[PDB]
Design a binder for this molecule. Structure first.
Ligand SMILES: CC1=C(/C=C/C(C)=C/C=C/C(C)=C/CO)C(C)(C)CCC1
Length: 134
């Protein structure tokens, strides 16, 4: 296992604050809140089965999806829309991309360690998540 996804990473923040907002138009306060909100997260995979959750005040969210075994998730709590996903390891990565009105809500959570450059495409005008910690 040359990846060790299973990590912690007190989220720093996203770059295109506004483009990720659009990925699921919560509200205008949403993006400004998350902009500065340095939340916590921590994934953990065992092979073909992983899970992670965010730790914010504003909103609580989670992905909890397998690795390539397509699944119709939901964004309940946040916006309340229906979605689907798909994940495939891509080096030290695990290319996820949402569906169900999304079609461009994917990430490039490739792990470096102490630093991390999750790239939140999330619709046109790609955003760059900015992680750092574990
Ligand atoms: C906008 C927004 C949030 C961001 C959620 C995300 C984007 C969590 C990331 C999950 C992923 C991509 C895990 C893959 O390892 C949360 C709910 C947390 C706080 C307020 C609103």
């Amino acid at each position: 296992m040359t990846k060790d996804q299973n990590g912690t990473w007190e989220m720093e923040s996203n770059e295109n604050f506004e483009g990720y907002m659009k990925a699921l138009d919560i509200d205008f306060a949403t993006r400004k809140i998350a902009v500065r909100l340095t939340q916590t997260k921590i994934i953990v995979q065992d092979g073909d089965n992983f899970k992670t959750k965010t730790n914010s005040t504003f909103r609580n969210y989670d992905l909890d999806f397998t690795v390539g075994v397509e699944f119709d998730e939901h964004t309940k709590g946040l916006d309340g829309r229906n979605v689907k996903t798909l994940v495939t390891w891509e080096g030290n990565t695990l290319v996820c991309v949402q569906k169900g009105e999304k079609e461009n809500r994917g990430w490039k959570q490739w792990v470096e360690g102490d630093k991390l450059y999750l790239e939140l495409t999330c619709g046109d005008q790609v955003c760059r998540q900015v992680f750092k910690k574990k």
